[model samples]
Target: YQRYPKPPYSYLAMIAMVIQNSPEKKLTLSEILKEISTLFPFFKGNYKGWRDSVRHNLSSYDCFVKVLKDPGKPQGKGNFWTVEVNRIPLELLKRQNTAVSRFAQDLAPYIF
Candidate 1:
């Protein structure tokens, strides 16, 4: 079964780890292009570049559902446990688009 771990470390972190820890410590668009090309060869997308790569490739809502559904399939690197969830960068996680934003909702109603 596929595993999907959400924030404070989501699938996005897993993507970064794959690229960062791969044979290439630093990756470029051309590298990812050459890598995934054969697999998702027909796939075409543009989201700026590597910065967007980690966000789009890993954080796709579709991928999230896929993991929750059929987790046995392996697409990326090792199991979700292979990555250190706590090490997930705060900058990537604390953004408004992340779940951290929802936690920011001040509950003044209950505070009073």
Candidate 2:
């Protein structure tokens, strides 16, 4: 077994969690990593594999949107990642608790 437990959710799902939990529903690639680390102690260890996976997932999925960082913002240098919350497939959200209601406040309408 691995020293670090693999999170039940996929990189895609984690990205969604980061973005959706954001005050603005957006995050830079770096901020994405930061949030994941904060949400999961598992990430506090080794810092390469999962980091690359997150980068790949952000670019590989069409459901994820890349937006220019807000003008004159001090957050980061790269584009912000936002999701087409409505476009994320059902299987992605399946790992989440059955209570999909919390999403209404800052969640996908259905699958988003």
Candidate 3:
């Protein structure tokens, strides 16, 4: 096994833990950031840069999925995130997917 730095704030580990410990295994972009702040009160860095780094990992890794958004707000601010699941029933996936997809589809949309 590889060694993780003390406090373990690596994007992958922290993000996965956030989702895993999440009651529903889902969270919003802001929620994830808030969680990070809670876990690392001493963290010091550019806020936007930190956010971008986390977002980049979320996008690049198959372990996370973009499942929804809020129509009332801009894209990144309104996006909902979930841990990716493969081999699950399509029906369940679509059901949950639809639940999330319905939150912002066909409404005010913005890219970020």
Q: lDDT (CA) for every model shown?
A: 0.36, 0.74, 0.56
Q: What's the C-alpha lDDT at position 19 in model 3? A: 65
Best by lDDT: 2
lDDT of 3 by residue, 38-94 (tens): 776533443346677788878887767777675555554566788654422222222
TM-score of each: 0.24, 0.73, 0.56
Best prediction by TM-score: 2
Q: Rank the candidates by TM-score, best first.
A: 2, 3, 1
Each model's Cα RMSD:
15.7, 6.6, 14.2
Q: How far out, in Å, is residue 96 in model 3?
A: 34
lDDT of 1 by residue, 1-49 (tens): 3322222333344344444444623344344444443333232444224
Off by over 4 Å in 3: 1-9, 44-48, 70-77, 85-112
TM-score of 1: 0.24
Instruction: State, as a TM-score between 0 and 1, how close model 3 is to the true structure.
Output: 0.56
Tens digit of per-residue lDDT, candidate 2, span 1-112: 2323556566788888889888888888989999888887778786557887899999899989988776666565699889887678757654544332232232233224
Alpha carbon deviation, residue 106, candidate 2 (Å): 15
